[PDB]
Amino acid sequence: KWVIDPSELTFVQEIGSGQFGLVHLGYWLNKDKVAIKTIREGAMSEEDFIEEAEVMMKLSHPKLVQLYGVCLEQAPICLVFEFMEHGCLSDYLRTQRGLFAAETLLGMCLDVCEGMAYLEEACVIHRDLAARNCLVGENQVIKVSDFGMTRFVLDDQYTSSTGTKFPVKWASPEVFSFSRYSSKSDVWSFGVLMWEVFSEGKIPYENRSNSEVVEDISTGFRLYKPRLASTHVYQIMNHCWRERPEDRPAFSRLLRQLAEIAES
Ligand SMILES: COc1ccc2cccc(-n3cc(NC(N)=O)c(C(N)=O)n3)c2c1
Numbered sequence: 001k002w003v004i005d006p007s008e009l010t011f012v013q014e015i016g017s018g019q020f021g022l023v024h025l026g027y028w029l030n031k032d033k034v035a036i037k038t039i040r041e042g043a044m045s046e047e048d049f050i051e052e053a054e055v056m057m058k059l060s061h062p063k064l065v066q067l068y069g070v071c072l073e074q075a076p077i078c079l080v081f082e083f084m085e086h087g088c089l090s091d092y093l094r095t096q097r098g099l100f101a102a103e104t105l106l107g108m109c110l111d112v113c114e115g116m117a118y119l120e121e122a123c124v125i126h127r128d129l130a131a132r133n134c135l136v137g138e139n140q141v142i143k144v145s146d147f148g149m150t151r152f153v154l155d156d157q158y159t160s161s162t163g164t165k166f167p168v169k170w171a172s173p174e175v176f177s178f179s180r181y182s183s184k185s186d187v188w189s190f191g192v193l194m195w196e197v198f199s200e201g202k203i204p205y206e207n208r209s210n211s212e213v214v215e216d217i218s219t220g221f222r223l224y225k226p227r228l229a230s231t232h233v234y235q236i237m238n239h240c241w242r243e244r245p246e247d248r249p250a251f252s253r254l255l256r257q258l259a260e261i262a263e264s
């Protein structure tokens with residue numbers, strides 16, 4: 001069962017501040033060390049979230065951050081996750097910039113691709129795959145997290161394609177135009193994530209506003225090759241950024257292609 005009783009949790013140390021509240025390091029009774037995220041009331045549709053717990057709890061892969069359960073006795077509710085000792089991938093790339101071998105960056109892309117190929121096979125769409133949503137664990141392993149979360153987010157400025165805070169930088173054209181989500185729109189976000197990894201955590205389209213990204217992408221602009229990305233890696237990146245979702249490789253195809261490059 002996904003319901004965790006407040007007596008089954010102990011908060012040990014404040015890790016930091018998330019978007020919707022606080023993140024703590026804690027222990028889960030008779031189980032493991034955990035990361036506990038406290039969610040501010042009004043931030044998410046708790047009822048819609050709770051409804052999908054039975055089905056969603058079954059998703060498990062070595063490259064996906066495990067969400068152990070939800071503490072919902074009293075407001076604010078808590079989300080109990082697998083503890084990822086090195087934090088988010090975006091901050092990790094940024095602080096370790098200049099210390100990454102090209103093979104390590106490719107391996108990080110491979111970890112995310114494998115996690116996404118599992119979600120794609122399970123018919124689960126992430127919707128907002130980005131380095132900020134990926135976590136770094138034991139021995140630099142990368143795990144995908146927060147998949148499907150934007151379906152519960154109550155801030156219309158983030159969820160609506162015309163929203164002031166819409167994550168347009170990771171959006172495929174059918175997503176930014178019509179909110180037409182698929183594993184193929186996740187493939188486009190994966191390409192941007194590959195660019196983020198190979199650029200050692202640089203922000204994509206830093207010099208552009210939301211409508212400028214939409215105009216550039218619609219007119220054929222694509223993110224420049226990062227210095228650390230080989231031409232073969234950049235070709236894969238461009239394949240993720242094909243205008244038509246049908247022309248984009250599936251995650252199962254990307255995984256074979258990226259593994260062949262890594263293993264030589
Ligand atoms: C457990 O309750 C839910 C309820 C709704 C969900 C909707 C989308 C995704 C969910 N979700 C998110 C997960 N992990 C994560 N790091 O974000 C998992 C999992 N099985 O590890 N399931 C959900 C998990």
Ligand SMILES: COc1ccc2cccc(-n3cc(NC(N)=O)c(C(N)=O)n3)c2c1
Pocket residue numbers: 015016017018023035065081082083084085086087088135
């Ligand atoms: C939020 O601030 C921090 C600062 C330092 C951290 C050091 C280690 C791990 C962190 N951490 C742990 C997380 N979640 C998890 N499942 O383990 C997250 C996250 N962004 O979801 N960040 C950290 C989070």
